[PDB]
Symmetry: D2
Subunit: 323 residues, 4 copies
């Protein structure tokens, strides 16, 4: 017989559907950082990568496979074809190119039907920008119920905010609580009322917190969050590590059904006086069926107005998109 | 009082010196993969990054910082100046010249030696008691160069060496056998890369020797062509370079595994490059990979592997070549 | 309206089923050790506990529940009714009667069998596709009993077997050699406990055979008495019982290690007890420990270890003795 | 030549003073649950166990050591003699007397003080620069006792305090809301146990205050009986003792969490007992739980929680009671 047959007696060949599979579509710096963080957190028993650039895709796959000794994910696959994504619990989209929106919409027109073909019951986690519009696009094309379409939204915005908060206060980010919500990016909203350490509201201690009458200009913290993005791009040409970690954290709650609360993009129709089909970030409960619940944050009139304004602009763009 | 003073009462401001600090020098693809893997394994209470390209360095540092909420390493710093690296337990060198030969009129050994000539004395100044882990290529020559320049004892200079080679070999082995690479044991030793040596006699699952079951294993007589497994390790390197331009994930995962044994004083055995004088008839100051016991003192012990005459000749040939090059170096 | 509804808007309500449920049956010293180890390794999204002592059961459940903040296992349930165990991927049996003064091990067997006659049908009823992992003693016999009663295919019935014997062996080996047990390879096989078999030919560090290096290894001629290392494994069992009244931490950790490979489909190789009829000249339905590949279908494969004549005779002796007891058991 | 020397060439004969060492004193259920949790979280490179019952102590150590293969804490030691504890970064005290039927919790204190009179000077003798983490009950008084006997600055003496109460509370809150305890924030402060104070104003999910949404939160007139949640925290303590005879898993898990912030200098905020003189009109040397920042120097900062008038009155009453007891203690 072969060496393998001399060495190993087989009891059954009966291979099985992968039980905890995750796919990452798009193997740019963002997708691969998602891949590595997911791998080192032992969240999946199979990982699939998809891209249109065949060379890089094989390269990244092999590089990951070569680390198998140090991981606990026994099967890593990749391909142009979506048959490699079959039976994913979680499919994470990081692929992408106003005109930029239609191009990413056209990309999604190809990706989403393929993903849905091979993992009809998967959850979709959208990272591609602009994330709130593209979460809408993903939801529209897939036909999935809203709970199964999660946009990264303000997850990154909030993580950066809490890092910066932690810096100012001399406290680990984990113990510095604060929510950045609404539209991901430039137009996000820092909810000053919720900012606290150990349940001590900073706004209560300092009622001018985050206003232009704030002596300490905590507004700058939120502004630093947005400038940070442009700076990191200017400094190294892309962003990778932080988004990747943030995405793996969402994957963790979902894959392990933790029901933790995260700032992610979800259908916000019916809230804050919004009536259109737009996705915005609120704190959501994440688990095996995706977003099952959301927290009803009390917003001020000014905060509601910002959210409302974002929704109007997003719908303005969305209604003109060609599917 | 400020909002900070209203929220927080301070007991003292003393001290603040890191207990488990790690430094990565050279934040390219390899360095940053080492960094992320180390952060996600909770090996350090502090991570420092150094490079000569100031913008990239700052961007990379910020990016890692922005992920703080998802990590347990509370302080990440960076700078051109080595003062950020002070009091490191472990310093990892992944710096090196660009691939495009036209960037310089010197060859890679020369360029990377001049780079080490700049890096090593500055690391030593600020972390005299650190362990040095050398990744940069050619890794065996450069581990020797780090040893010569640092003045460190042998145990405190560790070359990545055949750690990646072995990790790749076990991956491919696990694929042929249908067994996780953790349970597929096999050692690739000697000179890192093209000239590495797969030690057939030690390849086993559960203490059952593959060479014993299948005596043609590794020979040209072998009908299953197991020699090709080692050949595939070498080809993999060049293929991944062609496909994506560099390698990062595997090497970075492999470096973190060494850092784990070192930072936690595990005394696990890894295939890494160490001063090999005294073994295999090798009488020169050369570094080659053999299985080494890694802990808080670096390489405290090495395993004396019984090699075949061929295997021994290959290691000896590598030592001859390496020393041939090294003897002409100017410090 | 409740504060819950004031605070939280529900999107959908459907009760979902756990995707990675594990049951522990018997919440004595061993059971709870397995539980805490499984909780701390993030292996399950749901943990169920089952016992017949109702107050202890509830208390153990509550105590675990109270650490939820520091864990990532969202639901922990308990009850004497096996409906709490529905759809477990893995069911660990650690239930066992207490051996009385003047009671022999032979006598104990039938008492543990009677316990299994109640437990096994209930398990199979609510989780017909689970992997059964048997810890209860004498473990090789009770693994057979579990297999008999359940009607399961042999791949889904796993005895803890020589997994603990092997962990203790490798710990002692590591102490002798000054190497982490992770890097000290060695297999204790056959019948768990007193009659287990240390396979000298497979002991190695970095693939370097200790027996090749030291031919008298494990024989009476051995000046270093390595045979006493196996003897210490056996004596250590009795000594821990004598000192603290039971063994818990080591067994719990060893069980979590197996659980990890099973739940994560790792295909690592472990020394566990499996149906070995057809090997080593054994014709009887008996379970003994060989290295097995563990994944989501239990034992998909086993490694065929090359045993010396003495080693085979010792396994065959165990099989004859085990069968001799098994033939007289009342099911 | 010994087999070890044939197999292994030694580079240097070691050995560094312990670098990341933890001692646990008292190996009852609490101490051992702290031990296993610390071990499974890779917080220390050396662990030491102390107790006055020698066989139990030895057995527990052997049991942990036997699990080494599955751990990454390479040195585990124990002894009645405190030299085993030398150079610990962190020493965790879980030793205490058995409270006898009909004994007041009053003179229980002094019995425990007598234990500390022996323990504390011994700890200081061998690790004069450690942090003390006190678990033994009544924890706020015994933390004061360790402070006085040790001579340590207040930053280096930490009481487990309301850490467990808060973890139970957040579990219960998480149950009601259908949210993971990690996302359910809420602080139980003051005196550990019966007289602890649930701080209703800080209780929140995602920064949304439950007290603001629900003004009756914490009152008797509250239709939803949220006050019962804090009541259940204290009732669950007596209930767990009634059902299983002791508590272990949750306290163990909570202590490891504190240990993690200390050993890794995380500067996370925890509800633990600290010397509170100067706050809340408290004018005596007493230790009560407030949110503290924990890192390498123990408690470096504390969060100044805004308390209501009757929350303040509750802390002050505990202070008065605790002090009343302490000033009668014999050292
Ligand atoms: N939501 C958030 O907080 C953040 C979102 N992002 C966004 O993530 C996206 C990706 O970022 P990068 O990796 O830096 O971009 P990238 O351009 O480096 O990577 C994009 C990848 O998508 C691939 N791709 C394009 N069309 C495809 C198709 N039809 N099928 C499969 N793959 C396809 C490309 O080949 C490319 O490899 C961007 O849209 C970026 O703006 C980035 C950071 C944060
Ligand atoms: N030993 C092994 O198994 C492996 C070794 N390598 C080697 O690792 C090295 C790095 O790999 P890559 O990340 O792809 O190279 P890279 O060019 O992408 O990164 C090198 C970094 O070193 C920096 N650097 C140059 N001079 C410096 C100085 N004086 N001080 C500080 N930093 C300096 C550069 O600015 C650059 O950022 C290469 O030599 C490569 O061959 C790569 C894979 C495996
Ligand atoms: N294979 C191995 O390496 C090892 C096996 N063991 C075995 O594990 C078994 C238990 O060990 P310990 O936890 O120390 O004993 P233990 O007495 O502390 O725990 C046994 C538990 O089994 C429970 N039980 C009895 N009948 C039951 C039933 N019908 N349903 C559910 N639960 C039931 C008891 O109530 C008790 O709680 C013993 O048989 C022991 O020999 C122990 C150590 C190692
Ligand atoms: N602060 C908190 O939140 C909690 C505190 N506790 C307390 O922790 C303490 C221990 O709990 P258990 O482990 O269940 O008690 P236990 O009585 O089972 O264990 C106590 C151990 O301390 C040892 N000991 C006694 N005197 C000693 C000495 N001079 N030196 C060294 N060791 C000595 C005993 O020998 C015994 O093994 C108790 O006081 C208990 O009240 C328990 C749960 C929670
Ligand atoms: C939405 C985003 O622009 C913004 O609103 C700025 C902003 C503010 C606050 C935060 Cl937290 C982030 S996270 C983040 C991104 O979302 C992408 C950023 C980026 C990339 Cl990947 C590439 C080119 C430019 C940029 Cl700003 C990097 C990066 O850090 C981004 C955008 C970028 C490109 C196309 C469309 C929209
Ligand atoms: C030592 C190496 O050449 C070899 O012998 C080929 C080889 C065989 C077997 C293995 Cl396991 C590896 S690991 C590995 C490297 O060491 C670097 C490789 C590489 C890079 Cl980073 C850049 C350009 C070319 C190459 Cl081959 C990538 C990669 O996968 C590499 C070398 C590369 C550049 C300069 C000097 C020497
Ligand atoms: C199989 C076992 O006896 C042996 O053969 C001795 C032995 C040798 C080597 C190893 Cl590694 C172990 S592991 C182990 C056990 O399996 C149970 C031991 C034990 C318990 Cl829990 C209770 C009473 C006595 C014992 Cl020996 C503790 C313990 O450490 C045990 C047995 C016990 C009771 C009934 C029937 C059989
Ligand atoms: C301070 C404590 O009494 C209380 O106030 C009750 C209480 C209320 C709320 C919480 Cl969170 C806890 S945590 C906890 C303990 O601290 C010990 C408890 C306990 C043990 Cl270990 C043994 C006998 C009785 C008890 Cl109540 C168990 C347990 O869960 C305890 C005490 C117990 C014995 C001696 C002296 C003081």
């Amino acid at each position: 017989a072969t060496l393998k047959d001399q060495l190993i007696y087989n009891l059954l060949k009966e291979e099985q559907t992968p039980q905890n599979k995750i796919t990452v579509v798009g193997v740019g710096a963002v997708g691969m950082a998602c891949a590595i963080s997911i791998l080192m957190k032992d969240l999946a028993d199979e990982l699939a990568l998809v891209d249109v650039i065949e060379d890089k895709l094989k390269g990244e796959m092999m590089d990951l496979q070569h680390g198998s000794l140090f991981l606990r994910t026994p099967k890593i696959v990749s391909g142009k074809d979506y048959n490699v994504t079959a039976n994913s619990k979680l499919v994470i989209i990081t692929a992408g190119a106003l005109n930029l929106v239609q191009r990413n919409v056209n990309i999604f027109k190809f990706i989403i039907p393929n993903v849905v073909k091979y993992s009809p019951n998967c959850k979709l986690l959208i990272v591609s920008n602009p994330v709130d519009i593209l979460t809408y696009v993903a939801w529209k094309i897939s036909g999935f119920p809203k709970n199964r379409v999660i946009g990264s939204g303000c997850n990154l915005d909030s993580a950066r905010f809490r890092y910066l908060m932690g810096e100012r206060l001399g406290v680990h980010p984990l113990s510095c609580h604060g929510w950045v919500l609404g539209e991901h990016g430039d137009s996000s909203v820092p909810v000053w009322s919720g900012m606290n350490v150990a349940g001590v509201s900073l706004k209560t201690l300092h009622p001018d917190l985050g206003t232009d009458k704030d002596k300490e200009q905590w507004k700058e913290v939120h502004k630093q969050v947005v400038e940070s993005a442009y700076e990191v791009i200017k400094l190294k040409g892309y962003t990778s590590w932080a988004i990747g970690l943030s995405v793996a954290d969402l994957a963790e709650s979902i894959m392990k059904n933790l029901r933790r609360v995260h700032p992610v993009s979800t259908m916000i129709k019916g809230l804050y006086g919004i009536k259109d089909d737009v996705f915005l970030s609120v704190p959501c409960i994440l688990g095996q069926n995706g977003i099952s619940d959301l927290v009803k944050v009390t917003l001020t009139s000014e905060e509601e107005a910002r959210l409302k304004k974002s929704a109007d602009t997003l719908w303005g763009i969305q209604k003109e998109l060609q599917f």
